[PDB]
Structure formats: C-alpha cells, structure tokens
Design a protein around this ligand. Sequence first.
Ligand SMILES: *[C@@H]1O[C@H](CO)[C@@H](O[C@@H]2O[C@H](CO)[C@@H](O[C@@H]3O[C@H](CO)[C@@H](O)[C@H](O)[C@@H]3O)[C@H](O)[C@H]2NC(C)=O)[C@H](O)[C@H]1NC(C)=O
Ligand SMILES: *[C@@H]1O[C@H](CO)[C@@H](O)[C@H](O)[C@H]1NC(C)=O
Lengths: 50, 49, 49, 49, 50
Amino acid sequence: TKYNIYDVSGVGVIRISNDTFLNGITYTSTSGNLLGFKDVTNGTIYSITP
Amino acid sequence: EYLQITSTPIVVDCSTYVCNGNVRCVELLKQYTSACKTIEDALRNSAML
Amino acid sequence: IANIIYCNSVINRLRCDQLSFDVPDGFYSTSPIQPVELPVSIVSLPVYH
Amino acid sequence: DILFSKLVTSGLGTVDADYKKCTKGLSIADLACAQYYNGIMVLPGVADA
Amino acid sequence: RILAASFNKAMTNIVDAFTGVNDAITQTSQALQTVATALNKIQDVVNQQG
Ligand SMILES: *[C@@H]1O[C@H](CO)[C@@H](O[C@@H]2O[C@H](CO)[C@@H](O[C@@H]3O[C@H](CO)[C@@H](O)[C@H](O)[C@@H]3O)[C@H](O)[C@H]2NC(C)=O)[C@H](O)[C@H]1NC(C)=O
Ligand SMILES: *[C@@H]1O[C@H](CO)[C@@H](O)[C@H](O)[C@H]1NC(C)=O
C-alpha cells in the first residue's frame, strides 16, 4: 500500500508487531526510512517492509 | 604473527539503493546504463575470487 | 538488425537488464514487479482542527 | 575463542542477515534487516566456522 | 617410460580442457581443477579491463 503515516510517505506493507517500545510514535532506520509506528490509542506497534 | 586471510564480502543492489523501490525512479535510472553494471560487476566478481 | 531478444522471460529479463546476450555464471540480484493497484493508508495525530 | 571474545564484540559491524527473518516482519527490523531493505546484502564469511 | 607416458597424457587433458571438449570430465582430478581456476581468472581479466 502507499502510506502516509505520521507525515512520512512511502510504499510498503504494514503488519502487527510483538514489541512494546515505550518511547515515541515513529521508528526509523539510519537511512531515514520508516520501520514502524505506534497508534496513540491502545498503543500497538506496527512494522513496515517494502 | 597475525595475517589477515579474508575480508567479508558485500554486494549491493544498485536499483534498490538509489531508487528505494519507487517504480518511476527505476525507469529514469535505466538511462544510466553503464552506471549500475560497473558497480555490481566490481562487487560481485570480488566475492567470487 | 542482426538479432533480437524479447524481454519476456525471467532469463531474458536478466539479459536485458545486464545489457548483454551472454551472462557469466554467478549470482545476480533481482526485484519482483510491484503491484500497481495500491490502496492508501493514513495515520495522523488528532489535533486542534 | 579468547581471540574471539577478548576482542570487541562487533554487533554493530558486518553480520550476514537472516532474510527469512526480515520479510516476515514480526518485529521491528534490526540493524541488519534495515540494511537489507536498502539493497545492502552481507554474505556469509567464506572462512566458515 | 612411465614418467614420460604420464606427462604426455597430462598434456592432452590440459589442451582439451582449454578448448572445452572435455568440460564434462574436468573434475576427474584437482590438477584439472587448476585449469578451470585459470580459465575463471583469465575471463575476468579479459572482461573487466574495458
Ligand atoms: C597434490 O595434488 C594431487 C592431485 O593433483 C593430490 O593427489 C590426490 O591425493 C588424494 C589423497 O591421497 C587421492 O585420493 C585418494 O586416493 C586413494 C587411492 O586411489 C583412495 O584410496 C582414497 O579414497 C582417495 O581417493 C587422489 O586420488 C590423488 N590424485 C592424484 C591425481 O594423484 C595430492 O594429494 C596433493 N598433495 C598435496 C601434498 O597437497
Ligand atoms: C516475540 O517477542 C518476544 C520478546 O522479544 C520473543 O521472546 C518471542 O520469541 C517473539 N515471538 C516470535 C513468535 O517471534
């Protein structure tokens, strides 16, 4: 899917996760690409992969 | 006495690094015919030898 | 025109991208074709709106 | 094994990624899987264990 | 007589390996492995220089 998640846009696949990362809502790689995000409601983590 | 006998090989996909899987970028990249081929041949043949 | 090759098969696709009729033995990188019918996903912070 | 533990544990360095792990995406991609998405592939050491 | 005969038979397997008419039986000895290694190395020189 073509996504725009917390104002970061791209194309990838979204999955559910297993992590409980407490800090922040967007997680990025060194290149800057979006690796995951959190829903500021329940708090679930999701992952993003090309 | 210590002597190094190997260096860990690394290969890079030229299209993915430069265009990040964007379908329009890779189409423009294809005019750079001699660019990716030189890079990929250099890294690949080093690993084979 | 001497000879042509259609870029339709998997081996011919690799030959077309490597831009040579003969390909040496080895391990070559490749990327599958992206789907074009692409849904849209949006996540945003609820704010003063 | 003293020469492989007294020396620095290079967990931030070159390690061949488990590609069966990365695309499953059950957890946020680690440093090795992050490199894989940008086209960088580190191959297993030729001087195997 | 044996030293000469084994030498002469070795040369035939070398020349035929360079041409490739014995390519299906090039693993019969690690002496013929060096012929495959040399041809592998030469072809890189002939191609990579341009
Ligand atoms: C130098 O290279 C030569 C070959 O160019 C090596 O000769 C090979 O040595 C092995 C081990 O002795 C031989 O294999 C064994 O042969 C015996 C008898 O047939 C058999 O019982 C074993 O199960 C195994 O097959 C091999 O046939 C022989 N080949 C030739 C062409 O002589 C030699 O070992 C190398 N020497 C050094 C010091 O690196
Ligand atoms: C989920 O994460 C936990 C904590 O890291 C780990 O123990 C477990 O192996 C993970 N589960 C799967 C199925 O990968």
